[PDB]
Coordinates of C-alpha atoms and ligand atoms in Angstrom, one line a residue:
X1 CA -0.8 0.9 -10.3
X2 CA -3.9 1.4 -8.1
X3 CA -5.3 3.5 -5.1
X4 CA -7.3 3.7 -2.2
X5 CA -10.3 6.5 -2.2
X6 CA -11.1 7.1 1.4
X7 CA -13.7 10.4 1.8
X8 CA -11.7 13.5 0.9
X9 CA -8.3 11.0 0.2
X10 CA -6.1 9.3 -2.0
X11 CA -3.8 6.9 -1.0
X12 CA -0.9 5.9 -3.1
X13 CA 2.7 4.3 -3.9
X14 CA 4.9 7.3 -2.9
X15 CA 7.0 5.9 -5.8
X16 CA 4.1 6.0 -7.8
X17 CA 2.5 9.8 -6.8
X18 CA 1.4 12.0 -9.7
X19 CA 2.1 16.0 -10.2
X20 CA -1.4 16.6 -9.4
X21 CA -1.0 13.8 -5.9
X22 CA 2.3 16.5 -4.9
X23 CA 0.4 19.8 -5.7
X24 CA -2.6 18.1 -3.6
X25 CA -0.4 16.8 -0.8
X26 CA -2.0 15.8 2.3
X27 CA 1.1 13.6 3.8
X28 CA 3.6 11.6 2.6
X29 CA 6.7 9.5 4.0
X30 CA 8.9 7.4 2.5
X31 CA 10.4 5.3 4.6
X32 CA 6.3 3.5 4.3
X33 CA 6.4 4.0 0.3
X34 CA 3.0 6.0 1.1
X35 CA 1.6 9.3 -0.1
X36 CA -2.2 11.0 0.6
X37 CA -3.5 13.4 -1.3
X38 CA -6.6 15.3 -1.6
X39 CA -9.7 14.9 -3.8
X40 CA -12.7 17.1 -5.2
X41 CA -15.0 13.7 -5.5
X42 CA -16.0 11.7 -2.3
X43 CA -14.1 8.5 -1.6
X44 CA -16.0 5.2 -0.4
X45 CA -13.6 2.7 0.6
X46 CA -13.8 1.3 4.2
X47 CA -10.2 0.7 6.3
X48 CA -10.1 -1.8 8.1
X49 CA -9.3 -1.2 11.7
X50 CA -7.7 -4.6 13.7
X51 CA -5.7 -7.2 13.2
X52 CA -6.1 -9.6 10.6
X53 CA -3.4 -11.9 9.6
X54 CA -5.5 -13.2 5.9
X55 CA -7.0 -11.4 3.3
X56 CA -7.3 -11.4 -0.2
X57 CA -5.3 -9.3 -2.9
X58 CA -5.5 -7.7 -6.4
X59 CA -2.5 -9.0 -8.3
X60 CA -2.9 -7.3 -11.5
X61 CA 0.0 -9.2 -13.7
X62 CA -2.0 -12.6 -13.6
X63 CA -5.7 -10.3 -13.6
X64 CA -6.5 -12.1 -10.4
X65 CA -7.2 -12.0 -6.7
X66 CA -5.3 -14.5 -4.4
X67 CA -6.1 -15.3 -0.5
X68 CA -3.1 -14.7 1.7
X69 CA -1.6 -15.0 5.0
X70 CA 0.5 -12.1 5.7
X71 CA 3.1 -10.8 8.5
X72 CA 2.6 -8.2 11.3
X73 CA 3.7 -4.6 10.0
X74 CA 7.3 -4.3 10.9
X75 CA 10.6 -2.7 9.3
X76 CA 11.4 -4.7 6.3
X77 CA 15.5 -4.5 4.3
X78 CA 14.1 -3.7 0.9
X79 CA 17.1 -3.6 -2.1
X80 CA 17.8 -0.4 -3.8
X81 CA 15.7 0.7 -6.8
X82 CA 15.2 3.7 -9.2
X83 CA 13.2 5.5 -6.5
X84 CA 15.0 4.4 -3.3
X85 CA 18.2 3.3 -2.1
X86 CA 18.5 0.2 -0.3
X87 CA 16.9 0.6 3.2
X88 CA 14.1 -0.6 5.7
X89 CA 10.6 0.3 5.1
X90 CA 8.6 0.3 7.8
X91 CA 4.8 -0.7 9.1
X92 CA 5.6 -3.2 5.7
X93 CA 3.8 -6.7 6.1
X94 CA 4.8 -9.9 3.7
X95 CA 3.3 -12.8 2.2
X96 CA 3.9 -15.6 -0.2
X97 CA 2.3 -14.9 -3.5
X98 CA 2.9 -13.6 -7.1
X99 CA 3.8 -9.7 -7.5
X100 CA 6.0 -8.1 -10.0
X101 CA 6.7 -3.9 -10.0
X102 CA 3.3 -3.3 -12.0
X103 CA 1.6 -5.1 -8.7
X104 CA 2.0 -2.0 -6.6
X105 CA -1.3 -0.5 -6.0
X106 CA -3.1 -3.1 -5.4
X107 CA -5.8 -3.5 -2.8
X108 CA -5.0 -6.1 0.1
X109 CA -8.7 -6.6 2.0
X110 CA -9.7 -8.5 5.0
X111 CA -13.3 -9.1 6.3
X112 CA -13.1 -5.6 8.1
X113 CA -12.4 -3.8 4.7
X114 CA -8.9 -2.2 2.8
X115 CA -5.6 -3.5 4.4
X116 CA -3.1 -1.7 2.7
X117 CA -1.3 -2.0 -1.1
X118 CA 1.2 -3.5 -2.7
X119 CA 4.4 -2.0 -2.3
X120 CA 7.5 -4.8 -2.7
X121 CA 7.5 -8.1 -4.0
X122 CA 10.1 -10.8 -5.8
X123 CA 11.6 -14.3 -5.1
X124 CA 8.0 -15.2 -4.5
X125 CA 6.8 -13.1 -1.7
X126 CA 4.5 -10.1 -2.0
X127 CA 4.7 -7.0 0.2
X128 CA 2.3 -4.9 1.8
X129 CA 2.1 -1.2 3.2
X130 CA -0.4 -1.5 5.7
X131 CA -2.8 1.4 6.2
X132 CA -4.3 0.2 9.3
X133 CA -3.1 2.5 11.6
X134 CA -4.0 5.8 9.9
X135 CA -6.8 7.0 11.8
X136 CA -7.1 10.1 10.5
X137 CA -8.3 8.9 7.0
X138 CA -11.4 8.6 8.4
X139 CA -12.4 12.1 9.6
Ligands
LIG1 N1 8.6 0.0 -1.9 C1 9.7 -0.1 -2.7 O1 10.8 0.3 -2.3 C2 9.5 -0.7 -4.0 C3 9.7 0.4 -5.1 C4 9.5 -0.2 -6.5 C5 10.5 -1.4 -6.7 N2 10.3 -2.4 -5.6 C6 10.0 -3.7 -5.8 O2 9.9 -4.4 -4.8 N3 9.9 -4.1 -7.0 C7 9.4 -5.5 -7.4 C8 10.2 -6.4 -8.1 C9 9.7 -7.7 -8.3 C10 8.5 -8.0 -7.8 C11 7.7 -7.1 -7.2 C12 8.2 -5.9 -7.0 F1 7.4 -4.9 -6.3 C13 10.5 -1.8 -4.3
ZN2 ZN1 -9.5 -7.3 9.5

């Protein structure tokens, strides 16, 4: 589990999105595993806007944060699941660390601030659904 709060926005796991996250949609598409939704509170978390390659992530099933280098967004094969069939996710970005399915959520950050979240992970890699690109989270 975990989210990003961003002014008047929450980012989440698609997979993961509450009632309340659908009845407050914003945006949502699933071929990134992302979903926005709208908040009453104000949201303070800084994206990131470039291009980092290293950062550090939340990887809640060891209660730690590791530093990683991690791929260019790009369409990904990801196997089927309970919430999608087998498929590519796009703008996903992988690394080599510890995640299992409780890992989604997680905040990836670089010096510039938020990244993106965990979205995929196994066999020793972890994946990411960058964020960067979303402009419009800021305004
Ligand atoms: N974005 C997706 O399609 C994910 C939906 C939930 C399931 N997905 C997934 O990768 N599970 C997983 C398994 C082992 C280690 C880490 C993991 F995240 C795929
Ligand atoms: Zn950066």
């Amino acid at each position: 589990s975990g989210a990003i709060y961003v002014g008047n926005y929450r980012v989440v796991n698609r997979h993961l999105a509450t009632h309340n996250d659908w009845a407050n949609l914003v945006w949502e598409d699933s071929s990134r595993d992302l979903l926005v939704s709208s908040t009453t509170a104000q949201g303070c978390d800084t994206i990131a806007r470039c291009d980092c390659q290293t950062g550090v992530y939340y990887c809640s099933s060891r209660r730690k944060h590791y530093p990683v280098s991690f791929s260019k967004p790009s369409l990904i094969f990801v196997e089927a699941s309970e919430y999608y069939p087998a498929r590519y996710q796009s703008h996903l970005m992988l690394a080599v660390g510890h995640s299992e399915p409780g890992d989604c959520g997680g905040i990836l950050r670089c010096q510039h601030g938020v990244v993106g979240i965990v979205s995929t992970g196994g066999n020793g890699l972890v994946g990411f659904a960058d964020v960067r690109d979303l402009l419009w989270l800021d305004e």
